[PDB]
């Protein structure tokens, strides 16, 4: 198109045309905009593009054009500056400076072209980073001088300095070498005296200017690093905390500066400084009260209204108060004359803590946590804050977020329904609230009780009744469990329950009932200690829960299940024993009636139920009695099972979806019970084990048959998915059991051979899409637990899954994601526990193993990458451990350099940044192996190098060459310097890593200083 003209550099740049392209991109739309965008990117990325910058700046009438011009320069300056002839550097400096001056002197431009001026300033700052002060020593004194000549220039200088400080102190770590960083910090520091003087003057001879704001913006940055004397030994605190608080255009920035001040590095034994720290706070609070809002002000209301910058201001105030107090409140606590101030500050916080804004609430809550945690320990402090804490109890009790256990929620139509999904983002909020409230309760249990007991009584008499109110209250009451003495707790809980049951009676209809049920269940679940001392009560609670298991209300029903197991998890012993005035242990009662109780439950709920019963059964330590209970519990699934095993062994025609589901649910139930019973599950496992493995085979045959007859698409079908669920659940059951098994001999002698026989060949001999990753997962646990006892087995596992799995996952990084992850976990544990298995591999297979490892490195998926790196490290150790033997020798000869280069590659490609640490570790280990002469054979082949040549010398040479070719823009000395530093530092990871990081900086530019690698 017409627009592509600008891409043809063999002809002059048509600026007018450029401007059109740019306008089209920014102001245009659809296809046109899109084309223009691509055109512009191409232009920008053109390595000569920069040469046009001056022409653009001069002749363009579009600020975006110039901005782009500046991005081009910025790229050139940051990446290639020292590649440029000297003349070109000067020229660039001059026209960047000139432009800035010129834009500052024209008021209209200065007022209306801020974006472009800001960009220009940053561009300049990039030049400074390269050139200053070594090749620009006068920059600052002249900047300083220039500032008096013009208000615009002066203001603009402030922007420049703010950017410089940012680039030097705040954002340098990732972007500069250690040496260069230091150099520029040092340089800034050596001249800050003068910088500050200007800053102070401007601040003195002004009130509410854009110049004042700019100055204050720069101060915010300086505060990150300047020595404290500049803050404390000048009049600056007075200015900030009085003058600059009074006008709103300066207020926001001032407050942020004062916040940073409240974190300055500051001596602790200096009374006068303490006084100053007190004074600025006192001033600041005085300004708020008189210029903004009194302490009584309704901050919730104000925030909710969202005028102007109110939300921001309130946020910054919270940040200011919390930061200051957290650090300094002790300064205010002893001196009676400071009491009012301390309390008023807190009262502001209390008011802010009523605001409806989750994130802001969390900020304040974190402060409260800090405070109460301190009051809980520190002698004679709590009484100061008694009234503050009392108001806090209210705020928290009334803003309790829904606990994760409370599964009912109000929909948009005012109906109490089951939640669609977990409220995942309120989990931490609840913990934080509970923590603070727990502390608050400990601080004054009488207050807390009185508050709760009377709020509650106001629900009963109806005066204050509402869903929100009973809820927040109930949740609060549940959340403080543990804070009272058993005895105190006892009466409290009695009163609460009585009242909730009262509400249960008075408040009817399904929605009301759902709410009250949820609340009671939450409360009861939260007080196991109580339950344990009140058997009758406990028993009645459980029975009531069972009733709920027949609720048509799904939310309540589901909650009953979770509450049941929640209670059982803590109280199980009381179900296992025979209670006074009971005819049988309660578990017996539960089991006898399990069909009735669980009839209306969803399958997974039924499994949860069975799981709970398992917890109870495992309390029984007498083996005969326990096994008997297990037997009884499993009676229904075992009978279903026994009849299924009949029908299928007569004829492999299971083809029934109903049957498939039944089987799946049988296994799932076994899994559920195994999960809670662990090692104790063994007898039940044995009842089904052999038939279960046969069934696994039968089902495997069906899946294959189905794929053959219908195609791969078969695997999507409900039928096939169902058959696989059987296989997966089988695998899960065995995995679960083996992970918890206590008798490893039976695992090996009884479980392992048939398992392997049943699953391995099937996995190996299925088409890729039919292979269950769960097999891999199972095998990991097997190797983990008994790998040391089954060398031949481990070999078998590898033979059957290694190559076929590798071939699934080695075409790209994305296909078969579960296989991929499980695959490397398996290799990991094999490499750890059964290294011998890899020693037995044929050389070809071992090479693929090495490949497999490196491939893992190159993943961005962290699950894979991390394991890759670990396996590599373990492998190196495994090899080292073997000593000077042929296998070790061969390994190094074939693979040492493969690992070194692969590790380097991922370190340096900018795409594996998450792995930096472990990469570094691995690299350091590899280098240390040579540096320590732990490699007994020459790593080179003969005639390649003189015969005597040490592995150290060779390693250097290899590396220099690899780097020279890989990064040809680096100088030899840069490479040599880097390698010397790095090899010397192969015993000190933190230093070694810094050297790596410096290198990653230098490879992104040209002309990096080789001496940088001497940093120490």
């Amino acid at each position: 198109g017409a627009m592509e003209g600008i891409l043809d550099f063999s002809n002059d740049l048509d600026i007018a045309l450029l401007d059109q392209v740019v306008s089209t991109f920014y102001q245009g739309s659809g296809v046109q905009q899109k084309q223009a965008q691509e055109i512009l990117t191409k232009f920008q990325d053109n390595p000569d593009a920069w040469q046009k910058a001056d022409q653009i700046l001069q002749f363009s009438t579009n600020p975006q054009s110039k901005f782009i011009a500046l991005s081009i320069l910025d790229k050139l300056i940051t990446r290639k500056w020292k590649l440029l002839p000297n003349d070109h550097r000067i020229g660039i400096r001059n026209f960047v400076v000139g432009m800035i001056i010129s834009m500052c002197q024209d008021d209209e431009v200065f007022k209306t072209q801020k974006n472009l001026i800001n960009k220009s300033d940053l561009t300049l700052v990039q030049i400074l980073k390269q050139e200053w002060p070594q090749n620009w020593p006068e920059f600052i004194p002249e900047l300083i001088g220039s500032s008096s000549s013009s208000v615009n220039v002066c203001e603009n200088n402030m922007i420049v300095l703010k950017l410089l400080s940012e680039e030097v102190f705040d954002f340098s770590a990732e972007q500069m070498t250690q040496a260069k960083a230091l150099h520029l910090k040092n340089s800034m520091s050596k001249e800050f005296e003068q910088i500050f003087k200007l800053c102070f003057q401007v601040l003195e001879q002004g009130s509410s200017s854009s110049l004042i704001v700019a100055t204050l913006e720069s101060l915010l940055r300086y505060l990150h690093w300047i020595p404290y004397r500049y803050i404390y030994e000048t009049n600056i605190l007075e200015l900030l905390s009085t003058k600059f608080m009074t006008s709103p255009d300066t207020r926001a920035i001032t407050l942020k500066c004062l916040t940073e001040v409240s974190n300055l590095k500051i001596p602790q034994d200096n009374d006068l400084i303490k006084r100053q720290t007190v004074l600025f706070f006192q001033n600041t609070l005085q300004q708020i009260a008189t210029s903004v809002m009194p302490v009584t002000a309704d901050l919730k209301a104000t925030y909710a209204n969202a005028n102007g910058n109110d939300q921001s201001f309130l946020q910054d105030l919270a940040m200011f108060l919390t930061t200051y107090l957290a650090r300094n409140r002790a300064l205010l606590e002893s001196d009676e004359s400071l009491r009012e101030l301390l309390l008023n500050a807190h009262q502001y916080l209390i008011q802010l803590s009523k605001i409806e804004e989750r994130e802001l609430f969390k900020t304040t809550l974190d402060y409260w946590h800090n405070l109460v945690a301190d009051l809980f320990y520190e002698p004679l402090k709590k009484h100061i804050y008694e009234e503050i804490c009392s108001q806090l109890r209210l705020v928290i009790i009334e803003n309790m977020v829904r606990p994760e256990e409370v599964l009912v929620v109000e929909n948009d139509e005012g109906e109490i329904v089951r939640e669609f999904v977990k409220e995942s983002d309120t989990i931490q909020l609840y913990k934080s609230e509970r923590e603070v409230l727990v502390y608050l309760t400990h601080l004054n249990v009488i207050d807390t009780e009185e508050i709760m007991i009377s709020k509650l009584a106001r629900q009963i008499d109806g005066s204050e009744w509402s869903w929100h109110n009973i809820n927040t209250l109930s949740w609060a009451i549940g959340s403080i469990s543990g804070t009272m003495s058993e005895d105190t707790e006892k009466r409290f809980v009695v009163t609460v329950i009585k009242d909730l049951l009262d509400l249960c009676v008075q408040q009817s209809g399904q929605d009301n009932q759902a709410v009250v049920a949820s609340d009671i269940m939450y409360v009861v679940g939260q007080y196991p200690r109580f339950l344990k001392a009140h058997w009758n009560f406990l028993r009645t609670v459980i029975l009531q829960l069972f009733e709920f298991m027949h609720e048509t209300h799904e939310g309540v029903q589901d909650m009953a299940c979770d509450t049941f197991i929640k209670i059982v998890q803590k109280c199980k012993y009381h179900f296992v024993i025979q209670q006074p005035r009971e005819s049988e242990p309660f578990i017996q009662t539960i089991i006898r009636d399990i069909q009735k109780t669980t009839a209306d439950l969803q399958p997974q709920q039924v499994h949860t139920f069975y799981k709970a019963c398992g917890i109870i059964i495992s309390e029984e330590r007498s083996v005969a009695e326990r096994n008997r209970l297990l037997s009884d519990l499993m009676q229904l699934p075992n009978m279903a099972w026994d009849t299924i095993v009949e029908q299928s062994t007569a004829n492999p025609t299971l083809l029934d979806s109903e049957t498939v589901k039944i089987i799946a649910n049988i296994i799932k139930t076994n899994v559920a019970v195994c999960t809670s019973m662990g090692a104790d599950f063994y007898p039940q496992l044995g009842h089904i084990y052999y038939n279960m493995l046969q069934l696994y085979r039968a089902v495997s045959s069906m899946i294959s048959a189905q794929v053959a007859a219908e195609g791969l698409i078969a695997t999507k079908t409900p039928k096939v998915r169902g058959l696989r669920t059987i296989k997966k659940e089988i695998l899960k059951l065995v995995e679960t059991y083996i992970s918890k098994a206590r008798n490893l001999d039976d695992v090996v002698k009884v479980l392992v051979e048939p398992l392997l026989n049943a699953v391995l060949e099937d996995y190996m001999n299925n088409v890729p899409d039919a292979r269950d990753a769960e097999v891999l997962n199972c095998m990991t646990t097997v190797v983990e637990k008994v790998g040391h006892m089954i060398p031949q087995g481990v070999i078998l596992i590898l033979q059957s899954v290694f190559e076929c799995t590798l071939d699934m996952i080695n075409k790209d990084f994305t296909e078969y994601p579960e296989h991929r992850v499980e695959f490397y976990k398996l290799l990991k544990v094999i490499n750890e526990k059964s290294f011998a298995a890899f020693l037995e591999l044929p050389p070809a297979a071992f090479k693929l193993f090495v490949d497999a490892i490196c491939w893992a490195f190159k993943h961005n998926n962290r699950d894979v990458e991390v394991n890759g790196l670990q396996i590599a490290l373990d492998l190196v150790k495994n090899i080292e451990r073997m000593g000077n033997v042929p296998f070790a020798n061969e390994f190094h000869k074939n693979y040492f350099f493969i690992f070194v280069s692969e590790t380097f590659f991922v370190l340096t490609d900018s795409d594996h940044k998450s792995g930096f640490s472990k990469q570094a570790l691995l690299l350091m280990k590899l280098i240390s192996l040579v540096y320590d002469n732990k490699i007994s054979v020459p790593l080179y082949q003969e005639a390649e190098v003189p015969q005597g040549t040490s592995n150290q010398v060779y390693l250097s040479q290899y590396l220099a060459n690899m780097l020279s070719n890989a990064f040809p823009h680096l100088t030899s000395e840069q490479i040599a310097s880097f390698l010397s530093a790095l090899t010397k530092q192969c015993k000190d990871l933190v230093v070694f890593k810094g050297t790596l990081r410096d290198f990653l900086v230098q490879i992104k530019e040209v002309g990096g200083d080789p001496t940088d690698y001497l940093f120490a």
Binding site: Q37, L40, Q44, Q64, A306, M319, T814, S914
Partner: protein
């Protein structure tokens, strides 16, 4: 009533997927890296009328960065994205913010922690504090589950319209038409459709 929204954040954080979800309703499983920027209009219906975002969905991968900060020019609002399963992406948040606010000095910005649907969360709730001093709104989101997916836009809408009580409302639903050669090909097309498996058959819906 249209506002420029720039969307920034590390490669692979879910920026484009998030947008697409809002655009078409779909969930894109494949990671195809954005090249420079993609501009998409996006409308929401509110009690205060319709609001239009021109979403400038920028490239997070340095090597596909294109004009970089040039995209930010005259942005009226923004969303900074990270991935709660990837700590580096949170670490880079202040870099994205820096570059952004240098061009866009006074705009409302939402910080979004994506992919919370993933079990193994790495950037703990508790750690997420960068937004506080910077006056950014924060939300845990998931483009996959739609967890809080509407929140960033609702918030931004409220700030730009300047009405805290702004809510999304149902668009009126025009009566649809009574319609009735292609019959032959529709058979073919339907076949292909029926026998292509629906994704995520193991989801709740």
């Amino acid at each position: 009533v249209q506002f420029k929204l720039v969307l920034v954040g590390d490669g692979g954080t879910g920026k484009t997927t998030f947008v697409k979800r809002h655009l078409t309703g779909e969930f894109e499983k494949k990671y195809v890296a954005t090249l420079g920027v993609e501009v998409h209009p996006l409308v929401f219906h509110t009690n205060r009328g319709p609001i239009k975002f021109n979403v400038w969905d920028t490239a997070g991968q340095e090597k596909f960065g294109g004009l970089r900060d040039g995209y930010y020019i005259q942005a009226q609002c923004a969303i900074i994205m990270f991935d709660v399963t990837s700590r580096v992406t949170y670490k880079n948040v202040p870099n994205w913010h820096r570059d952004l606010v240098r061009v866009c000095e006074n705009i409302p910005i939402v910080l979004c922690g994506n992919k919370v649907d993933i079990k193994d969360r790495k950037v703990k709730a508790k750690s997420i504090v960068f937004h506080r001093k910077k006056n950014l709104q924060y939300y845990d989101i998931s483009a996959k589950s739609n967890y809080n997916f509407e929140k960033p836009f609702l918030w931004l809408a409220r700030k730009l319209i300047g009405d805290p009580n702004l809510e999304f409302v149902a668009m009126p639903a025009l009566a649809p038409p009574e319609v009735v050669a292609l019959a032959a090909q529709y058979e073919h097309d339907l076949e292909v459709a029926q026998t292509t498996a629906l994704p995520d058959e193991d989801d709740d819906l």
